[PDB]
C-alpha cells in the first residue's frame, strides 16, 4: 500500500486558463470583469456654462 504523494502542482496545471482570484484580505478580489451598465445622463449638467 502506497500513497499518491502530493497533488498540489498536479491540479495547478489542471486549471490552465481558468479565472484567477489571487488577492486576499478576508475578501476574494477577482481579476476579471465584464459588467454591462446603462448610464443615465438626466440630472447631470456642465459646471462651466454660467
Amino acid at each position, epitope marked *: 500500500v502506497v500513497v499518491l504523494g502530493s497533488q498540489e502542482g498536479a491540479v495547478h496545471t489542471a486549471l490552465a486558463g481558468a479565472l484567477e482570484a489571487e*488577492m*486576499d*484580505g*478576508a475578501k476574494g478580489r477577482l481579476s476579471s470583469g465584464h459588467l454591462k451598465c446603462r448610464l443615465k445622463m438626466d440630472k447631470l449638467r456642465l459646471k462651466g456654462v454660467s
Partner: antibody
Amino acid sequence: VQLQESGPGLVKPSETLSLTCAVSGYSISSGYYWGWIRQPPGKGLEYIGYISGSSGSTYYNPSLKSRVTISKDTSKNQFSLKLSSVTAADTAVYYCARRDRVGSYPYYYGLDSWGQGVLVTVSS
Amino acid sequence: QSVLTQPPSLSASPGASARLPCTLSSDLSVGSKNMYWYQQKPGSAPRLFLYYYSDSDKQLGPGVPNRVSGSKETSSNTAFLLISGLQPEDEADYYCQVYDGSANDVFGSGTKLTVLG
C-alpha cells in the same frame, strides 16, 4: 494607511526590547514590505530591517545582525520588533514605515507612509 | 562601504533657489539610481519629500509644490534637491536614500536646511 507605534517607556541595558506597530488602515499579507527605521538622538536615520507582507521573509541590517528579530501577525493586523541585548547607544526614536518591493512605480520603492514614532532610552 | 555624505548645515535667504546636493559613494552610478528625498520637520516623523530619477521620471510628495525640483550631475555622481520658492516653512532636515546591490536601504547624512531672516 496611518500607522501608530506603541511600546514600553524604558528598558534596562542588555534586556529585550519590544515595539508593537499597528497599521490601522491597510491589510497586511497583501505585500508592501514593512520596516523599522530609527534616529538615535538627533543624528541621521538608521534602518534595522523589514519583513515581507505576503511571504513573510525578513531582511535585516548587516551591523544589527544577531540582536534583532522582527515578527508579524495578520490576525490582529500588527507587526512587532524585538531588540535583544540592547546597549546604551541604542537609545533612539523608532518608526515603523511602509515600502513597496515589486510595484511598477518607483516612488513607492521608498518609505512612503511613516509612523508616529516612539522615544526609548537605555538609562538606569 | 556604500554610504552617502552631505554637509551638516546649509542656509539661504528666503526667495533664492536652494540646491541641496547628495554625493553618492564611488561604487554607485547616480545616473541609473532612483534618488529618494525625505523631509523632517524638527519633531514630526519625516515624510517622503521627492523621488527623482530623471527629468521625465520623477514624483514629488503628496502636497509639496513644483518649486521642489531634482537633477543629477553624472560627472561627480551627486543628486540634487532644488527648492526654488524658499518660504520660511522650508526650514527642515532633508535626507537622501538609495539602495545597494542586495536592495538594502542606504540613507544619507542629510542637510539641516535653515531659512534665514
